[PDB]
Structures are given as structure tokens and as C-alpha cells.
Amino acid sequence: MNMVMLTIDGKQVQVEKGTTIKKAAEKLGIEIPGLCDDNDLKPFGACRLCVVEDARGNLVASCHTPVREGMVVKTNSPKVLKARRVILELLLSSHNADCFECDKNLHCKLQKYAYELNIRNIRFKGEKRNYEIKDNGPIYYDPNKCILCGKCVRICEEVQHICAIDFASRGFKAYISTPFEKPLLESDCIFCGQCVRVCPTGALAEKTDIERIYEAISDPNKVVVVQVAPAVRVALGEEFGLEPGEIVTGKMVAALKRLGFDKVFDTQFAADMTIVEETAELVERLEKGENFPMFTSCCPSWILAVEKFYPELIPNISTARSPQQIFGAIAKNYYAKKIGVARENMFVVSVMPCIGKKFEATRPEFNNDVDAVLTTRELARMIKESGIDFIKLEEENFDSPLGESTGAAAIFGVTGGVMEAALRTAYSIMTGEELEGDKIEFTAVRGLEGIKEAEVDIKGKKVRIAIANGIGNAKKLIEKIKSGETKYDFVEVMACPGGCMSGGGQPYTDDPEFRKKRMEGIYKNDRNLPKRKSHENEEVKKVYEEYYEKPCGPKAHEELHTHYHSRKKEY
Amino acid sequence: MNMVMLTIDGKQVQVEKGTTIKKAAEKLGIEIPGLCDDNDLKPFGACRLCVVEDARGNLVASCHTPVREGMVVKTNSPKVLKARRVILELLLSSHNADCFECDKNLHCKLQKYAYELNIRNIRFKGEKRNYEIKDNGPIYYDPNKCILCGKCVRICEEVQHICAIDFASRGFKAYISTPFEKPLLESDCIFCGQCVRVCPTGALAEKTDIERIYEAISDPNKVVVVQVAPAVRVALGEEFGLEPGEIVTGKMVAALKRLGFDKVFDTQFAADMTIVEETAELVERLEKGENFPMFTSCCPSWILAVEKFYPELIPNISTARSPQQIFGAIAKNYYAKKIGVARENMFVVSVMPCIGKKFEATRPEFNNDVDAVLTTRELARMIKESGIDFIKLEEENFDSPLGESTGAAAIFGVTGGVMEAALRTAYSIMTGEELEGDKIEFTAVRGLEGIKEAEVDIKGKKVRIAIANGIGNAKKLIEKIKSGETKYDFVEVMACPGGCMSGGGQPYTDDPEFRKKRMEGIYKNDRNLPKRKSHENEEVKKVYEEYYEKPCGPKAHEELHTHYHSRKKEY
Ligand code: HC1
Ligand code: HC1
Ligand code: SF4
Ligand code: SF4
Ligand code: SF4
Ligand code: SF4
Numbered sequence A, B: 001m002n003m004v005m006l007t008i009d010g011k012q013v014q015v016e017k018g019t020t021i022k023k024a025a026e027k028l029g030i031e032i033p034g035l036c037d038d039n040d041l042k043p044f045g046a047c048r049l050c051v052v053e054d055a056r057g058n059l060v061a062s063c064h065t066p067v068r069e070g071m072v073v074k075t076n077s078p079k080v081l082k083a084r085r086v087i088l089e090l091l092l093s094s095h096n097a098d099c100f101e102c103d104k105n106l107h108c109k110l111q112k113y114a115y116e117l118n119i120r121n122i123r124f125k126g127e128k129r130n131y132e133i134k135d136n137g138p139i140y141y142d143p144n145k146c147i148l149c150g151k152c153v154r155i156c157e158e159v160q161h162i163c164a165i166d167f168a169s170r171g172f173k174a175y176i177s178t179p180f181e182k183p184l185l186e187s188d189c190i191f192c193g194q195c196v197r198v199c200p201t202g203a204l205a206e207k208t209d210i211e212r213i214y215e216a217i218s219d220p221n222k223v224v225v226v227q228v229a230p231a232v233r234v235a236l237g238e239e240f241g242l243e244p245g246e247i248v249t250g251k252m253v254a255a256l257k258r259l260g261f262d263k264v265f266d267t268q269f270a271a272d273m274t275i276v277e278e279t280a281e282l283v284e285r286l287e288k289g290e291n292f293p294m295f296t297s298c299c300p301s302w303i304l305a306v307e308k309f310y311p312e313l314i315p316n317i318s319t320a321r322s323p324q325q326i327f328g329a330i331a332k333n334y335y336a337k338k339i340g341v342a343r344e345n346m347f348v349v350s351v352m353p354c355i356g357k358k359f360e361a362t363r364p365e366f367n368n369d370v371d372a373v374l375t376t377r378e379l380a381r382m383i384k385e386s387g388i389d390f391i392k393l394e395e396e397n398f399d400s401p402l403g404e405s406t407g408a409a410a411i412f413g414v415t416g417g418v419m420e421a422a423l424r425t426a427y428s429i430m431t432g433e434e435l436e437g438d439k440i441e442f443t444a445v446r447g448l449e450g451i452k453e454a455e456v457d458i459k460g461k462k463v464r465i466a467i468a469n470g471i472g473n474a475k476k477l478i479e480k481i482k483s484g485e486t487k488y489d490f491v492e493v494m495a496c497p498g499g500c501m502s503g504g505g506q507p508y509t510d511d512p513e514f515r516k517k518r519m520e521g522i523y524k525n526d527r528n529l530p531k532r533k534s535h536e537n538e539e540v541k542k543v544y545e546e547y548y549e550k551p552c553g554p555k556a557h558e559e560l561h562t563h564y565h566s567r568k569k570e571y
């Protein structure tokens, strides 16, 4: 910690050595514009829109310039403003401008910068960008709106370590493409959605399914049911002017009821069911002591990565379905018979903060259990379209009999929650007594680190457990495990860094501390429930005693389990 | 007060007879979209975008439909949504879409409605609107972005009673125009700016002078000074996410200092100077008892209306200049000599919430005292462009020696404040003692009524005063006065209803209660000052004792007075 002296706009500043001009001037309440830099990535130097003027009189980029003693910097001289205006005019001279038709309307950064830096008349009119738009599955790519900032390539290469996309061509005709413009499905993409989360323009977007939902609601011979993800209730309020991490569960239930859905449920019931199934499977595997370690299967992107890159780990993957598909099977196989509705006349809609769920819902092995999948942004758009005000709503509760949940299933939206809940159930199953007091929380698996390791002692038996949030950390853990350095018993993997609260379907943010706020909100929501264990749920016991009669039973194995196949297209 | 009961979306509602469907459904927290209706105007029925479905199955506009007993209304049926989408597609099929170049970017209502009601692909592509844009002075009109809602015509005809514009042509080729497409200067326009304040698109806007200010700041052989209007400090914070009526004086002074201005002053000093001059003139006129009544001259639009429509009242108008021109003359005739700057090397910039000041600054009789005029929105745009954060600024004070002001000059941004301050000074001048306690406030001239008439007794002498906010009320008062029903002694007129806080240069609002909030903020700001009288100002006494030596003196009459001419172009 050694400090340096500098003058920014006539004000003395104390910053540590190595800090750039941008981070040094941030402490004076000055925001320098920039489009190609993000808090997760190294500086690139492509937009050239953050230039400042030093004492000599030259323009220098302030995003990758280290600080020095005795430096004089000017940030709002007329020359800098003129250069920024010219650069933005150069960008906007070759933009296809359907801001009426653009999904990123009122959320674009190029539009906001064009407004703020006072552009009203483009002098450069001529050749534009013109390409062809092709379907890439659940991701929509329009190369006519690209500004070539490299954020998607950098996030896919530096952080995710997948390297599914790169630059193509050179000069005015450069663009982002997969090898030979092949569709993303058979490329090395695993459908995590982090590239869609950082794009500053409307080039990368989502595939919408709202029209099918509206045409199924208007159908007078169908019943529509909806399920809500645990992580949607802490980030939905951001779209309506609230702070991150504020619970809007009752408001969102009331809004969904006002939208026309006949029955509103939650996925945490399926989360408890999956917890019970997985804990029973883990106990049986530990008794047998075969096929170690055991990996979870709740993340579709992790399953895709296993199928594509590591096809030798398939026997070690847990066969339990994800909570979404389990809920779909429950609704279309048990609830319909109780109510008296034919299987062909029931519609199931899910609201998820993920993008791999859109692809997962269309897999042939699930027999079309879930008919449509939405995101948080799509739900917010629907709520705003219908005209409901969100601030002044009245709190309501979930429907019956698949609405009540516990606290162990409320922390699946953050990294390490699934492991904590599994340990909570496994301690009770193995020992027979219930944890009381502060022993319920396992503080050794909480945080935002890369690889988290722990050793929980259960009545004299020690289990080696691990958690790895992120694809890169997952690859590192796999390399560590395969070499035989150490042996584990249960491993969790999540494709997004920080858990499902950082998914590609969450509302856009500008605060650099959204992860901490959302994690705090999730933990606070967990702390305010009457039940904190999965086996204390009441409707799960009824479902077992009425339809399946035992976990891992023949009917359960037929309807609540799945199998995986290798997708490795050898070349 | 009789109530009517109906069913809206399955919810029972009890409203008074005569309320429309829109105002009845507003009480359930439901916002029905609409573009052609405003809180100041009668329903028109042009956009057809607020349709709802009744029990019979037809579509009825909910903005001009009275409520009835036993009515069933559906607001979010699929048919209504489809109709709204088709109507908006029909609008956007013929729009010139330079949303990069549009002044109303991020503030347009058509853009927000295109976003919310989920438009992504226009099926109707063909002929568009194409016209020619011509200069109309301080108002910018682009007929390629008009949606023909009639708000400007209705506000000019129903409320202002001027009728300067109307519809032209018919069908697809209809547009808004003056007789024979003549420029607005020689039409019946008085430059109030209320039509610019209600337009929902970017068709109507104001002319910008930012480039000249930047090119004069970069000039190393000039000194730039700025003056701020009393009403800018209660509405500038709205642009940065604050509530109306919040005082941001110190924050705005700090921001202006960081913007490059060498010296920052305020107009309230000139307001006190004008108060002294006007009170002396009124006392002399009362002693002489000639040319009654006496009208104020602080509103340029009122002067334009007098010159155009009522040229027989010119001898009765007070000859004192407006505070803006008085401040300009003071800066360019007294401050420059004290500092030692030539008259040709001084630049004066004003920030005003008015549109008529832009035209007033260019009159030949003022010898170009003020070089440029800004608005609150332009200042906010400049602040956002420079990168300063408004929320976390540090409070500062005005420069010297023309910065200190009193409380009597802080209420010129609301209707009736000028009369209150004039009475405050006139009581002291006529009697010799000073008002103390609650007698300072004259509660009989406060409110938002049309014509406010009072009767103030000053030591046995009774004076008749009248206040008329609005052009229509001004015409009514003139008709009352001319017929000889009664005689007054002092009359105030403001062209905008509610005072200068409703000017055409203020930031856009959506709350229907902005006038009350801004008036409360202005009064609270007035209540928190140490001095509440104009003769108690200290720098005014120095200016008199050093330069002019007496109010209404030869030098003062030469530099602080003006004359008016008839603009009535007979036909
Ligand atoms: O399936 C499942 Fe789930 O370790 C998981 O993963 S957590 Fe959910 O806050 C939902 O829907 C989310 O997001 S229920 C999923 O994705
Ligand atoms: O000139 C003058 Fe003035 O009764 C007046 O009128 S009040 Fe001002 O809040 C300013 O600038 C404002 O607005 S100083 C003017 O328009
Ligand atoms: S979805 Fe993930 S793997 Fe696919 S391109 Fe984007 S960042 Fe790379
Ligand atoms: S697709 Fe988006 S993130 Fe990738 S280079 Fe283009 S603008 Fe940047
Ligand atoms: S990417 Fe941004 S600038 Fe381009 S059309 Fe979409 S909203 Fe407008
Ligand atoms: S971690 Fe969650 S949000 Fe991310 S890919 Fe997996 S399921 Fe989707």
C-alpha cells in the first residue's frame, strides 16, 4: 500500500500504485464514458471513447493507463468532447436503426451515450452494414447492430474457458462468428448465456415465446399453470425502480394472478422433492461405495459440458431430473388426474432466470413436459404491457396443494445452497436426530470463492466435499481429481460464476456490487421461513404416500430419472 | 354526491356519477395507455389507443365514456392487446426514425409505448411522411415526427385563447400549420411555450445554443459569467431522479463551477433592483394619480400580447426592464469597469425556464446585453455530458459581489410573488415602519385561482390590486377593466398558468400534482432565508451609492428603462 500524487481537474487525489486513471478519477465523482471495458475483463482499448488530455497535450486512453507521480489530467476540455462526438458520429453513421423494433430499447448503452453526448445531426452518410440473420436456437444474433467491442469473445475465452466464438474477416467487414457460420448447437457452445449478459447493444438477444402463451390463454379448452424460480423473487423488483435483493414474492404472485394464469405454484416444492431423491441416492451410493465422486445434475449447461468435453464422467452423474422437469411431470401426471383434466389440455409455463432451460425444455427425452419457458425480463415486459402497477400491489399467497415450501429450498439461487440443503437432509438421514440452533448453517461452504472445500464430520464419519462455481473452476477441479491428488464423495458444479443469481435471464444492472446484494437478499429470505429442512415438508409426504410410495421406486425411477448420452462429434 | 357501482376486471368499484372509465379504473392501480389526452384538456378521441371491451363484445374508448350502473369492463383481453399492437404498428409504419438524432430521445412517449406493448417487426412497409423543416425562431418544428394528436392546437385554443395554429389539409397529408406557412414571428404567436410543453413526440422542440457557449469558453481572451433563475433550483433535481420541489441550489452552483464558468451569480439581485425601481415608480404614479392602472413588464410574452392585440395599454405599462436584462446591463456596464475588462471581451449566459426569454434576448433595443440563453433541460444535458454526478456533490455558495440575495426575490417563480414583494417594499416606503411577525405574508394573494383580487389597507389608504395568471384570465380582466365596472391601481399578468414554474423550459413530468409540489418548495425556500425584504439588501445600496446615486435617476433612466412599440400589422 504505497500512495501516489496526481492532479485531476485541479483536485489532489490519493491512490495506490497501479490504479488506472479511470479508477482514480472515480473517487472524485467523475464518470468517464466507455463501451469496451467491464468489471470482469481486462482493458481492451477498442472504443477509444475514454480519452483524456494530459499536460503535454495528447489524447490518452484512461482505461489502461497506469498512474504516475506529478501527473496533470484534464477530462472535460473541448478537444476531448469534440473527439468523442466525432467517434460516436462515426459509429452511428453505419448503424441499422430500428430502435422501434429493438429488444434492447430503453436499455441500450449506445442510445444513452448518443443522448448524453449531444448528437443531433450526422454528417457522414453512406455505406452501412448489411448481413443475414439466422436462428441460433435460444440466442438471437443480429450482426447489423454490432459495434465490435469484443466483450462476448473476451468473456467466453478469459472467464468461461470454452472459446466457442472469435473474430472473423478484417477491416470494415469484420464480424463475430463460429467456424464456418455453423449453428451454435453443434459448435462448442454450452448455452450458459454470459455473452448475452454483457453485450452493450441489441446484437445479442433472446428468443421470445410470449405469443404462444397468449394464444394458449385465449384458448377456452386449456388450463394454464405457472411455476416461479427461487431467484426471480429477488431481482424482479429491480425492473420497477427498487434496489437489488428486495423481496417481491407477494407482489409478483398478485401480478401473475392478474395476468390471467389460472394456478400459480413455485418450484421449491420440486426442489425439496429433488433434495429427497438426491439424498437417498447419495446415501445408497455411500453404502455401496462405487462410482465416486458423484456430481449434481441441476445445471443444464454443466450437463452439456459433460456430454461434449468430458464424456467419461457420465456414469458418475446423478440421474435425478432438474426441479423444472420434475414439477412438469408432477403437474401433468398427478395433478391433472386429481383435478380431472386430460393430459393434452394442460399448459405449463415456467419463469426462469436461465438460458439453458430454454434449450433443456425441448429435449426429446422429456416427452414435452414443459410447453414454454420465460425469463425475468420477459415477465417484467408482460407486467408493464398489461398495465399493472407494481409498487402499490397487495400481497397474496401461492395456490394449493403444490405451493407450500420450506427454507432449505429457498437457497438454490446462490452457490453452495444445494450442498447445504443436501447436508442438512443427509445428517438427519444418517444419524436420526435433527440439527438445532446455529448448527443448521454450514458457514464453511458460503462465499464467492473459486473452489470451496470442506470436511463435515457426521458422528465420526468424515466426507470429502467440494463446490466449484464456474466452468473454468470446474475444469480445474476435474484436472485435480483425475490426476489422483485426492478423492471426494460429492461435488457441485454451476456454470455461472456466483450461482443462478448471475444468470443470463436476469435484469441488467450497473452497480458493481449486485452479487453481494442478491446473496444477502437470498440469505435473508431463507432466514425468515418457519421450516428449514426438506423432510419437514408436508405435501411431499402426501405425494409419496399416494402415488410413488417410496423414493427411488419403480414408478419414481420411471418418471423422476433420466439418462445421458455422449455428444462428442469426433472429427 | 351520488355513487355508481360497476365491475372492472372482476373488482367492484364505487365512483361518482360522470367519471369516465379511465378515471374509475385508475383507483384500482390500472394504467390504460393513451396519447391524445391530457389533464388540462377535454377528451378528443384521436389515438384510439385506450379501447376496452365491454360485456357486449365491442371496443369502446375509455377516455370519453361515462360510467353506468351494472357495467362489465375487460381491460387486458387478447383482442384489445392485438388492436393496440396493430394501431401502433400503423403509426410506426410512417415515422422518420432518427432516434439517435432526436432531441426527445429517452423522453418520448411513442418510444416508451413501442417498447412496452412489445413491437419487434413491422409488417407494413411503404410510403412515409416527407416534409421540409423551416426555422420558426426559438421553436423547432419537424412535421415528419407528428402523430396528429391535436394537443398543441387544443392547448392554444381552449386554454390560452390565442388560436395561432390549426389543422391544414386532410387525410394522410394532414399537418399543423400557420396561415400560409408563415413564420411564427409575424403570426399571432406570443412565444409562451405551452405547446412545446405538452407535445408527446419530438416534433416540437426548442433551439439550442450550446455550441456557441462551448466555442466562447475555449476562447482564451474572454470571461464568461452565468446567472440562474429563481425557479431553476426547485425543478433541476427532477432530471436526476429526485422529487419535485427539492432544493438543489448548492449542488447546481458546484456543478456550474465544475462546468468551466468563471463566475456564477444569481438573478435575485436584479430582482431586488427591479423591485426597488418598480416600487418607486408606483409610489410616484400614485402621488401623481395618472395613467391607471399600472401593469408589470417582467413577462416577455405579456409584452408581446400587449404589442400585438392591445396596443392602447402601452402608456400604462411599467418601463422597468426585466431582471435578466437589468443583470446583463449591470454586468457589462459596472462589473467590467471594476474588474478591468473591455465590454467586447465579456460573455453573459443565462439559465431560464422560459421560451420567451430566447426571443427577448435578441431584441434590437437591448444592444445585445445577453449573449446566450439556456434552459433547465439544456443545463441538465450539459451536466450529464460532462460526467458530474449530481447526488454526491458538495454544497457551495455564489460568487461576489453580486451573489447575495434576500427572501423577497425568491418567490418570483410562482404566481403572486411579485405583488407580495412589491407590497412588502411599498408598505415600508409609504409608512416608514417595518412589518414584523406573520404580517409579512399576504395570504389573500396566494393560491392557484384564475383571477385573484385583494384589498390591502396601508395606514388608512386602500389600494386595489389584481393578479391574473394566464392569457385567458388576462383578457377577461382587460374586458372587465375597459368597461368601467371597477378601477384598480396595480395589476400583475403572467402568460403561463401557475407562474414561471410551469414554463416551457422546465423538465417533463408525469405526476398530476407538480404545481402544488413546486409551489410548496418555492415557499419553503423563501421561508428559510435571513432577510425577507428588498430594501434590506446590502449590495443594492452600494450600487446606488457608487454608480446611479438615486432610483429613477438620469443614468438609471438611461440604462434601466425601455420603451415599447406597436406590432399590430394591419391587414
Ligand atoms: O432446475 C432447476 Fe434450479 O441448483 C437449478 O439449478 S435453482 Fe431454479 O433459483 C429454476 O427454475 C434457477 O435459476 S429451480 C434452476 O435453474
Ligand atoms: O426576467 C425575469 Fe423573471 O416575475 C420573470 O418573470 S422570475 Fe425568472 O423564476 C428568470 O430568469 C423566471 O422564470 S427572473 C423570469 O422569467
Ligand atoms: S453462451 Fe456461453 S459458451 Fe456459448 S458463446 Fe456465450 S459465453 Fe460462450
Ligand atoms: S456481439 Fe455484443 S458483446 Fe460481442 S462484440 Fe458484438 S457488441 Fe460486443
Ligand atoms: S442496439 Fe441500441 S442504438 Fe442500435 S437499434 Fe438497438 S437500441 Fe437502438
Ligand atoms: S448456474 Fe443456474 S443460471 Fe447458470 S446455467 Fe446453470 S442453471 Fe442456468
Ligand code: SF4
Binding pocket: B155, B156, B160, B162, B163, B164, B165, B188, B189, B190, B191, B192, B193, B194, B195, B196
Ligand atoms: S407558443 Fe403559445 S401562442 Fe404560440 S403556438 Fe404555442 S401555445 Fe400558441
Ligand code: SF4
Binding pocket: B145, B146, B147, B148, B149, B150, B151, B152, B153, B176, B195, B198, B199, B200, B201, B203, B204
Ligand atoms: S405538433 Fe405535437 S402536440 Fe401538435 S399535433 Fe403534432 S404531436 Fe400533437
Ligand code: SF4
Binding pocket: B095, B096, B097, B098, B099, B102, B103, B104, B105, B106, B108, B109, B110, B111, B145, B201, B202, B203
Ligand atoms: S419522436 Fe420519439 S419515436 Fe420519433 S424519432 Fe423522436 S424519440 Fe424516436
Ligand code: SF4
Binding pocket: B191, B192, B298, B299, B300, B301, B302, B353, B354, B355, B356, B357, B494, B495, B496, B499, B500, B501, B502, B503, B504
Ligand atoms: S410566466 Fe414566466 S415562464 Fe411563462 S412566459 Fe412569462 S416569463 Fe416565461
Ligand code: FES
Binding pocket: A033, A034, A035, A036, A037, A044, A045, A046, A047, A048, A049, A050, A061, A062, A063, A064
Ligand atoms: S473503455 Fe477505454 S478504450 Fe474502451
Ligand code: FES
Binding pocket: B033, B034, B035, B036, B037, B044, B045, B046, B047, B048, B049, B050, B061, B062, B063, B064
Ligand atoms: S386517450 Fe382515449 S382516444 Fe386517445
